[PDB]
PDB file of C-alpha atoms and ligand atoms in Angstrom:
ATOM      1  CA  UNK A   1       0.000   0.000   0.000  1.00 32.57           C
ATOM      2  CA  UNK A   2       3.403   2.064  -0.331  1.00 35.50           C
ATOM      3  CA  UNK A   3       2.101   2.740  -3.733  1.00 35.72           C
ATOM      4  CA  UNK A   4      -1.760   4.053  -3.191  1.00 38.02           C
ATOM      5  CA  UNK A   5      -0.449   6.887  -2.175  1.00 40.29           C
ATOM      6  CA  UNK A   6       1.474   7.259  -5.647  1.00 38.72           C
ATOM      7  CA  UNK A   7      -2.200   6.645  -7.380  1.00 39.57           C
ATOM      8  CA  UNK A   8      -3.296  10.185  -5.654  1.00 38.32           C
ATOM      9  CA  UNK A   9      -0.689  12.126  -5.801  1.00 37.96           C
ATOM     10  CA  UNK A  10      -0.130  11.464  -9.699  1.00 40.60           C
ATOM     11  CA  UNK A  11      -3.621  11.965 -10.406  1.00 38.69           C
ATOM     12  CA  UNK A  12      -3.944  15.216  -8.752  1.00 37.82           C
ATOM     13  CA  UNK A  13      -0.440  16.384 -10.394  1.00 37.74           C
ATOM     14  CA  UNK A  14      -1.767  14.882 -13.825  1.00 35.56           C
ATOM     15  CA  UNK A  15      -5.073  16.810 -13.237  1.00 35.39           C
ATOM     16  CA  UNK A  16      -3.035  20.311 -12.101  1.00 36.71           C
ATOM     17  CA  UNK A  17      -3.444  23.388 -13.734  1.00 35.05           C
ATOM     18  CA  UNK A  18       0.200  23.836 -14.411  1.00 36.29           C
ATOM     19  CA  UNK A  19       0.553  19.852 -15.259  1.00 34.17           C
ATOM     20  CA  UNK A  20       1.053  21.159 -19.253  1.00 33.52           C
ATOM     21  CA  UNK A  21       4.430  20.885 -19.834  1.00 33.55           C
ATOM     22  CA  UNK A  22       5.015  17.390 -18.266  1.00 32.20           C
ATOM     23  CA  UNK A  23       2.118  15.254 -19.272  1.00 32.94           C
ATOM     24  CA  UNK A  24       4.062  14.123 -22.148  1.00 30.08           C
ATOM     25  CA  UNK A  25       7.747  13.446 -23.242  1.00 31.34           C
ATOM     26  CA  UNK A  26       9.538  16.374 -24.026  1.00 29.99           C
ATOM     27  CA  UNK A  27       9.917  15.573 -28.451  1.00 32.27           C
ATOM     28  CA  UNK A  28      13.244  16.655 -28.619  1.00 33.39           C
ATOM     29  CA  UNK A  29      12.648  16.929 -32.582  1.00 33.55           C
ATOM     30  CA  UNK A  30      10.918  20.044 -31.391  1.00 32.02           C
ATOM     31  CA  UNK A  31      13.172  21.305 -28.888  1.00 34.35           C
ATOM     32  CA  UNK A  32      16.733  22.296 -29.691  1.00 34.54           C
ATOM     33  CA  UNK A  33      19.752  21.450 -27.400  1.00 34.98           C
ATOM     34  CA  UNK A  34      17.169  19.158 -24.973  1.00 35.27           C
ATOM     35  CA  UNK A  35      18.889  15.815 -26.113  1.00 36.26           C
ATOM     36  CA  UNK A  36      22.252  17.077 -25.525  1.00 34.69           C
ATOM     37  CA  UNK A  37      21.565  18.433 -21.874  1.00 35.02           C
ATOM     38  CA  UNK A  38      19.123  16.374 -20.626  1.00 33.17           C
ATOM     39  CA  UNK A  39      20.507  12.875 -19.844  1.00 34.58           C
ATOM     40  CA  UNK A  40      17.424  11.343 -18.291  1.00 34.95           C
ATOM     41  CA  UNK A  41      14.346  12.839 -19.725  1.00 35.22           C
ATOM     42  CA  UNK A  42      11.405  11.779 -17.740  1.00 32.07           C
ATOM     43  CA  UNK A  43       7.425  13.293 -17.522  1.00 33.38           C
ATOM     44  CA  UNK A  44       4.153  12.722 -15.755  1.00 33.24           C
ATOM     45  CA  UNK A  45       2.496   9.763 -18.546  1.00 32.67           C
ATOM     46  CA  UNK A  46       6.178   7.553 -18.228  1.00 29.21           C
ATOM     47  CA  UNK A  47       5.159   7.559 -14.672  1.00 28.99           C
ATOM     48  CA  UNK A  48       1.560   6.802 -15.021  1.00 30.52           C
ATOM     49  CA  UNK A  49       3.139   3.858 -17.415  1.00 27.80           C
ATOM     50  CA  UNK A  50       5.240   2.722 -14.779  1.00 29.35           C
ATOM     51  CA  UNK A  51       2.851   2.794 -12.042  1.00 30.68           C
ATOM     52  CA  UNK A  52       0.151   0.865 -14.327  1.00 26.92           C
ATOM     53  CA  UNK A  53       2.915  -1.841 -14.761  1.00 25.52           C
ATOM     54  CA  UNK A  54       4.190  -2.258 -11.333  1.00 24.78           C
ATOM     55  CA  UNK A  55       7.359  -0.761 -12.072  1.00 28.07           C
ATOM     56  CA  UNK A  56       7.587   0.940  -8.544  1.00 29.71           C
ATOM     57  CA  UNK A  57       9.056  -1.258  -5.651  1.00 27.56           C
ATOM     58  CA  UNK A  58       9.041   1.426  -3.180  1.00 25.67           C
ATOM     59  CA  UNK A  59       7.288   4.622  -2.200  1.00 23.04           C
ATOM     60  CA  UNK A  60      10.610   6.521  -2.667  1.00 26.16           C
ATOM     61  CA  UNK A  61      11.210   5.218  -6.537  1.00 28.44           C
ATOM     62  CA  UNK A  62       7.961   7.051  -7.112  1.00 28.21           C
ATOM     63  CA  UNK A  63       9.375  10.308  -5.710  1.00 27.12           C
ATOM     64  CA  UNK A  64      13.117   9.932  -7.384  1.00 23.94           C
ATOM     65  CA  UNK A  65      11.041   9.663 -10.901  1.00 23.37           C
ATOM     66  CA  UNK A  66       8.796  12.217  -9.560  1.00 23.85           C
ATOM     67  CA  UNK A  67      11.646  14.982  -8.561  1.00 23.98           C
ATOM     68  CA  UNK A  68      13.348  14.210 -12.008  1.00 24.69           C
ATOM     69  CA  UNK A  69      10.728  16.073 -13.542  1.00 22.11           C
ATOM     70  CA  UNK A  70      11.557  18.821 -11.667  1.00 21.32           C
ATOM     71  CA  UNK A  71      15.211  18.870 -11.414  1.00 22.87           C
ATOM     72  CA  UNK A  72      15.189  18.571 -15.413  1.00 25.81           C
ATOM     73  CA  UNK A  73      12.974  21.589 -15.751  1.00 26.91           C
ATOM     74  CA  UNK A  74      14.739  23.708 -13.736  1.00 27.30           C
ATOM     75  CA  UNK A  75      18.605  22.442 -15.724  1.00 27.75           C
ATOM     76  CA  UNK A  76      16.974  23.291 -18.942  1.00 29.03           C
ATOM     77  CA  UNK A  77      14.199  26.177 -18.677  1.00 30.51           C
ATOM     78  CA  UNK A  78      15.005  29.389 -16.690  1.00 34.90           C
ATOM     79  CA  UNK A  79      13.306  30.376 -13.478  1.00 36.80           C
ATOM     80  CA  UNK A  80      11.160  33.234 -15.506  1.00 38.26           C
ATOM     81  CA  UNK A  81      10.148  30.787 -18.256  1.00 38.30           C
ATOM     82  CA  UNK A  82       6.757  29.766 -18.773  1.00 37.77           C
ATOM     83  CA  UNK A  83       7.834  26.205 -18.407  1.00 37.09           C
ATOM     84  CA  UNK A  84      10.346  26.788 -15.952  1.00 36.58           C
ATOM     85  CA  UNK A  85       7.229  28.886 -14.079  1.00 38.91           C
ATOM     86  CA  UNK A  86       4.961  25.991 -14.325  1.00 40.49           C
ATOM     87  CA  UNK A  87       8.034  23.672 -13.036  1.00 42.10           C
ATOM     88  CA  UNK A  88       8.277  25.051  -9.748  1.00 45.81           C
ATOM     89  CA  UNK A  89       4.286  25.117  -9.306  1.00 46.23           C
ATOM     90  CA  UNK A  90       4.177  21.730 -10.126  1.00 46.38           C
ATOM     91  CA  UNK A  91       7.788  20.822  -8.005  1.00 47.45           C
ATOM     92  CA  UNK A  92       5.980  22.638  -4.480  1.00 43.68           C
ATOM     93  CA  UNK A  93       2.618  21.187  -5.141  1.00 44.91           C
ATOM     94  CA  UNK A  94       4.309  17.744  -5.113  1.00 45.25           C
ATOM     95  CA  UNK A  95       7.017  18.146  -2.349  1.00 42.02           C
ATOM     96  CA  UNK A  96       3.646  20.429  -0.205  1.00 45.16           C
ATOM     97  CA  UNK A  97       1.979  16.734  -0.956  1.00 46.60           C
ATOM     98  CA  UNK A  98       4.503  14.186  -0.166  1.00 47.30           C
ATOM     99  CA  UNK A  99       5.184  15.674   2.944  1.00 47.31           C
ATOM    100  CA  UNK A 100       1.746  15.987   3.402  1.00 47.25           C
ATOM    101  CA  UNK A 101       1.535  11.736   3.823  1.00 50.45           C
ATOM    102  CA  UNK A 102       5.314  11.035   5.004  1.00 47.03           C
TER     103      UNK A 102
HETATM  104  C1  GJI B   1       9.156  19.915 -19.728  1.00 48.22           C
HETATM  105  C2  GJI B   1       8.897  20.791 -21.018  1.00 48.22           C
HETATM  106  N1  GJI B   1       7.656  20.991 -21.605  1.00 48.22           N
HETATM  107  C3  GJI B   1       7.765  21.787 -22.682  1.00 48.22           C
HETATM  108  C4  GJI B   1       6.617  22.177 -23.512  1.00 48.22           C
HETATM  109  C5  GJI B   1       6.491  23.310 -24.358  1.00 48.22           C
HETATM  110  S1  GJI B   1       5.039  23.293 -25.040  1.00 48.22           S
HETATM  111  C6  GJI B   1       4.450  21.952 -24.354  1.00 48.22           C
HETATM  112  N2  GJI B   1       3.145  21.328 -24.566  1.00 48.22           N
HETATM  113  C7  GJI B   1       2.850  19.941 -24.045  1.00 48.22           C
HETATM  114  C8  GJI B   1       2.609  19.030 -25.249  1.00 48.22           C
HETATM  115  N3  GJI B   1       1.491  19.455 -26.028  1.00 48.22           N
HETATM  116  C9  GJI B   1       1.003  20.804 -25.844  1.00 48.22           C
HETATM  117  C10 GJI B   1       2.001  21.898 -25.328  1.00 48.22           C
HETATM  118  N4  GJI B   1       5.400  21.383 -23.524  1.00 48.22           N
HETATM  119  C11 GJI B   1       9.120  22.136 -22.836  1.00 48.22           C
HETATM  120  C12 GJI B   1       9.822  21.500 -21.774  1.00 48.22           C
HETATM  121  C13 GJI B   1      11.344  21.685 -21.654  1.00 48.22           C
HETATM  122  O1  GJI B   1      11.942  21.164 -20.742  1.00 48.22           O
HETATM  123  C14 GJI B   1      12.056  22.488 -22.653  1.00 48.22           C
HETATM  124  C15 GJI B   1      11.220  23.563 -23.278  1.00 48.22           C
HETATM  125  C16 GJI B   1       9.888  23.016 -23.871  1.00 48.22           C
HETATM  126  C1  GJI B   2       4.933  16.933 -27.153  1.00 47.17           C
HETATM  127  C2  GJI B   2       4.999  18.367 -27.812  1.00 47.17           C
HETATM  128  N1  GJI B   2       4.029  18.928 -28.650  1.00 47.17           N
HETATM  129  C3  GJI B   2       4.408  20.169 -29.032  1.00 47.17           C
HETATM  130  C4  GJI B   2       3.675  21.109 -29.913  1.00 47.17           C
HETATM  131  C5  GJI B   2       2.499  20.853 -30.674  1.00 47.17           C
HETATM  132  S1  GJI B   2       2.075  22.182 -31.473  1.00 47.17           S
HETATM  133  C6  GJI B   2       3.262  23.173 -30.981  1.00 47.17           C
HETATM  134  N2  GJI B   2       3.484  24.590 -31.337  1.00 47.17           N
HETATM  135  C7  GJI B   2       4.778  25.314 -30.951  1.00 47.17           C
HETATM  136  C8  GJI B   2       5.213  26.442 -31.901  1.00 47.17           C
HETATM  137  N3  GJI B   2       4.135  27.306 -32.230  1.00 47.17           N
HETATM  138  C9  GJI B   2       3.085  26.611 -32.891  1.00 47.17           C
HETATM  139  C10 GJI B   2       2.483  25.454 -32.041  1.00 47.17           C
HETATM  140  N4  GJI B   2       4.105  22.490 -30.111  1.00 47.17           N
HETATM  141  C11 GJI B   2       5.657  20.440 -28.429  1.00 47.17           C
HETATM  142  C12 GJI B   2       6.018  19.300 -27.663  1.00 47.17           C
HETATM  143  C13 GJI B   2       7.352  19.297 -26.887  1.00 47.17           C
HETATM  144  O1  GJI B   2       7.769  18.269 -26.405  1.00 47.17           O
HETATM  145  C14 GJI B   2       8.138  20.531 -26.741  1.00 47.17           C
HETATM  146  C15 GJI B   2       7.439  21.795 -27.145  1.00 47.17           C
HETATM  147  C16 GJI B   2       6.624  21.667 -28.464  1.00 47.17           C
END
């Protein structure tokens, strides 16, 4: 039940206003310089395709994919970006929430 936590949180970040730029992969056909800097791309739906498959062993796997999001928006966007903006909505609204059951 480490994980039915995961199924909350992930639906109310999917469902979050500033959820746009993560719900799916960043297409890096579209973005220049985002393959080059960005070793370990990861977004909101490769979770949700994780989590549907069992992928996550442990509460805290959920929460190192989870802070990847975050940690690559704020190494590629700036702070003032609209992305990078959205980033750190969506990065306090998670860490506010995983505090918020651990
Ligand atoms: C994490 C991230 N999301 C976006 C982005 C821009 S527009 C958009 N969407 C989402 C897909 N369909 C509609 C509009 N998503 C970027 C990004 C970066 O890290 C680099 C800059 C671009
Ligand atoms: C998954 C994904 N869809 C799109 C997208 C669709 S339409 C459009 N534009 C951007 C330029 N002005 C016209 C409309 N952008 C992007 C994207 C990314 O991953 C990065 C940002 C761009």
């Amino acid at each position: 039940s480490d994980l039915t936590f995961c199924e909350i949180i992930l639906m109310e970040m999917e469902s979050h206003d500033a959820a746009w730029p993560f719900l799916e992969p960043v297409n890096p056909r579209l973005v220049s310089g985002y393959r080059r800097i960005i070793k370990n791309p990861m977004d909101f739906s490769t979770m949700r395709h994780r989590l549907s498959r069992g992928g996550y062993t442990s509460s805290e796997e959920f929460a190192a994919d989870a802070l990847l999001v975050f940690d690559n928006c704020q190494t590629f966007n700036e702070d003032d970006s609209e992305v990078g903006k959205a980033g750190h909505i969506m990065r306090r609204f998670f860490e506010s929430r995983w505090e918020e059951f651990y």
